[PDB]
Design a protein around this ligand. Sequence first.
Ligand SMILES: N[C@@H](Cc1c[nH]c2ccccc12)C(=O)O
Ligand SMILES: N[C@@H](Cc1c[nH]c2ccccc12)C(=O)O
Ligand SMILES: [Fe+2]
Ligand SMILES: [Fe+2]
Ligand code: NI
Lengths: 229, 230
Amino acid sequence: MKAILQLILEKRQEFEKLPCFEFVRDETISPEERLILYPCIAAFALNFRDLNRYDYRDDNSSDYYQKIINIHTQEDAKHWEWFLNDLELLGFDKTMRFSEALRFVWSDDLLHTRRLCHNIAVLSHDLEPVMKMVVIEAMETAGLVIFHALAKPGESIAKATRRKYLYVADSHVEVETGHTILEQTQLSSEQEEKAKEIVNKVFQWSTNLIGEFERYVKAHRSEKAQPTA
Amino acid sequence: MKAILQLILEKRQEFEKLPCFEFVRDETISPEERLILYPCIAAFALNFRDLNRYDYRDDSSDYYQKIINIHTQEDAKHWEWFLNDLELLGFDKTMRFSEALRFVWSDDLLHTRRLCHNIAVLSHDLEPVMKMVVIEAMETAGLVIFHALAKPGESIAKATRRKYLYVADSHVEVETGHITILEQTQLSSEQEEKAKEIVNKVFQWSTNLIGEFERYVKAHRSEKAQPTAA
Ligand SMILES: N[C@@H](Cc1c[nH]c2ccccc12)C(=O)O
Ligand SMILES: N[C@@H](Cc1c[nH]c2ccccc12)C(=O)O
Ligand SMILES: [Fe+2]
Ligand SMILES: [Fe+2]
Ligand code: NI
């Protein structure tokens, strides 16, 4: 189990270095340009809400680990509204045809973004609570890397425009920083092998999402955020 | 297997009877009113495209998975027909990006939205002959739905002189020729019991989607289709 927690740090240290994040943290580039990837998260954020509401959560469970997951899911299932809040603030909540919105979400350029929650649902669907906690810890660690990064230009725009950002914001990183129990557990021989595969898959799928964000920024480099004071 | 194919026919006969289908077939109701449910299909039609491209399809060398892959290729095309008839019906409305997302992720379209999710979770570890059972049940549920929606659909298509592609006989026709190898297939005791489970879950999830369509019409009785003549 210490190995599993050490692999998660190893992957986070790799994950933290991706070009996307070097770009996002680059105070030499305007924060509006660094948040060009923002509308991309539309293919993920509400899927993530549903992963928490409908896939992770088991309300009827007595399992020690499942009751902790249930509390966690109740928090994480709230963040999609924060995504919609900042979409409007950043000027990305634009008038379009319904079909344009569907074609955007279901773009082949947002495949890995769109299917990250799907892959996690398939991975998790027959795991015991303890093994679900490994899935959630890895996923939560990747999320904290991304939002730590995105809160840099997010908080720069929030200060310059005198508006309260909720998603690409320190307040979002604060709740997810919380997201002392894995430490307090030891895995079967089989469980350790499954755990390593889980951590490897979640970071591989998260890196695939970040790869699409990077390509979108390049392909749509002019489509900067348009916040108003 | 003979039992499994007979359970799918029993399930179809029950599914055919749902109140939503009596409504969609009721020629005393304007077809514009009967297609109030059409935008609901936005939570399913592109998820179904992805189920076909990514979950069913395995681009293996097993004879059965090669048959599945052929099937998925046609089915992965119909989402475009959905977006064609969305525009013709006057449902391709201008709206905020967030309004589109809130619509697709509406709690009133939960079962519509998760149908494909549920089939992918059910399917992901199945051997090919059993994926074929999922596909055959799902194709049977679909044929019942499009047989019904093609009624108000072809009424509007004639009245306005426009080629409908999704709520249309041409969709029902490609589906009709879409089973030979399953009938030619021996399955074990275990496969038989798992085949039963698949057919029950595919029809109950399709029943839940159709229940949401019926509820949507009742919540949105003023939002009738607004087609224009050629
Ligand atoms: N905190 C993110 C969720 C998140 C967790 N893990 C992730 C990995 C990649 C992208 C997003 C995430 C949200 O509220 O929506
Ligand atoms: N014919 C539908 C596919 C379909 C199969 N089974 C279904 C069950 C419910 C709704 C739709 C379906 C389409 O092309 O999109
Ligand atoms: Fe979050
Ligand atoms: Fe179809
Ligand atoms: Ni499984």
